[PDB]
Amino acid sequence: MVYLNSMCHMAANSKTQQIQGDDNKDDKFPLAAISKVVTTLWAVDRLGPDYRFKTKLHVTPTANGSYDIHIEGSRDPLFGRNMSYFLISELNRMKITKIEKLTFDENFLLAWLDTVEQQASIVRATLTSSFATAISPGYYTILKTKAARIGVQMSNRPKIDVRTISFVKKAEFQKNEKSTTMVLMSAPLKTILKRMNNQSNNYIADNLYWNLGGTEAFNAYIAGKMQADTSDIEFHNGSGNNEGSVAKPVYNEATCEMMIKVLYSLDKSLSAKGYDLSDVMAVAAKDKASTVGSYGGVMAGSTTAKTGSVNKAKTLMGSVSTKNGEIYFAVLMHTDYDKSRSDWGVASQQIKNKVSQLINQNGGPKAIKYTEQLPLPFDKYSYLTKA
């Protein structure tokens, strides 16, 4: 069962600022991963698009010749394989190849994809597998080549040998007298958001949402920002994934109007810092690693957008650039993908045809100024630096 729940839009240049749409534009529907755009807005407002996550390494020489290292985490929600490979590269550039005790605190988050001890157990497990495995030359080579494109140098065939990896809480970490402290800054937040909104599992959005205070903080933010409450927008996580079962699902939900208000606000907060939607959201046809990279037709090169797919919904929202100006849009479809596998692709085609009509009946597409960015978790200021 594929059918329209709601479609709405507004011209960026509207003097009335009245959102246009069908009669369902003020009823709540599942959002799926367009939720990530709301999480994006929150993060931009709270942190700023140039914010960097400052992970600290406390490094102490051992009588051996080797090092102990304690990671004081910054809750960087994008510390994954790429970033781990870069850390290893950096350790080798700093002449560290052997670590005796590697320790890490509760703020050191790791994306291989409850409670503090148990969360840290999973990070430890992941770390121990990852650092005890040879770095894959094919994956590293591709990564080193992407890094060189943004002028980041990485080591040749890097490696690390770690004796032990343990959880040490921030409160119980005693900084050694002859430790050095080095900082490994993330790429800017806008870049992390770019990566998240191109294509991701739940991990980044969910960790951002928790970092910022979770649901109680989110509802206070939305009330302050939008004069909105839970009848406009009801979140349970940052990502929009199912928090229930297949039979009784629990999805983030919002009105079509709220999605437009989000896009407007996001656009405004970004412009204040000189940035565009296409700095944090995928560009149809241009962003090849995204869910809209194979979009063609009039959307190609003209459209900034985020996809969503859950059992009960297929969604799209963003901005289309037309000869009549930029236009914010959201389309929310109903699906029953658990019952009928064909619904996601059928829904997706109906959304594209709806957005193509929105473009084609507003004078046709006007290209945006955009060249495919590579949203790596580090940039040229990420190098280990003695702070």
Residue numbers in the entry: 38 to 150, 165 to 438
Quoted passage from the original study:
Here we show that Bdellovibrio bacteriovorus utilizes a small ankyrin repeat protein, Bd3460, to protect itself from endopeptidase activities during entry of prey. We demonstrate that endopeptidase complexation by Bd3460 prevents cell wall decrosslinking, and that both the Bd0816 and Bd3459 targets bind this self-protection protein via a common epitope. Previously, we assigned prey cell rounding to the action of two secreted Bdellovibrio peptidoglycan DD-endopeptidases, Bd0816 and Bd3459, that act to modify the invaded cell wall via hydrolysis of the structural 3-4 peptide crosslinks.
Structure and activity analyses of DD-endopeptidase Bd3459 revealed a highly active enzyme with an open active site adapted for prey peptidoglycan diversity, rather than self-wall maintenance (this was also inferred for the homologous Bd0816). We next utilized a modified version of our original Bd3459 construct (starting post signal peptide with K38 mutated to become the new N-terminal methionine) that represents a more ‘native' signal peptide-processed form of the DD-endopeptidase6.
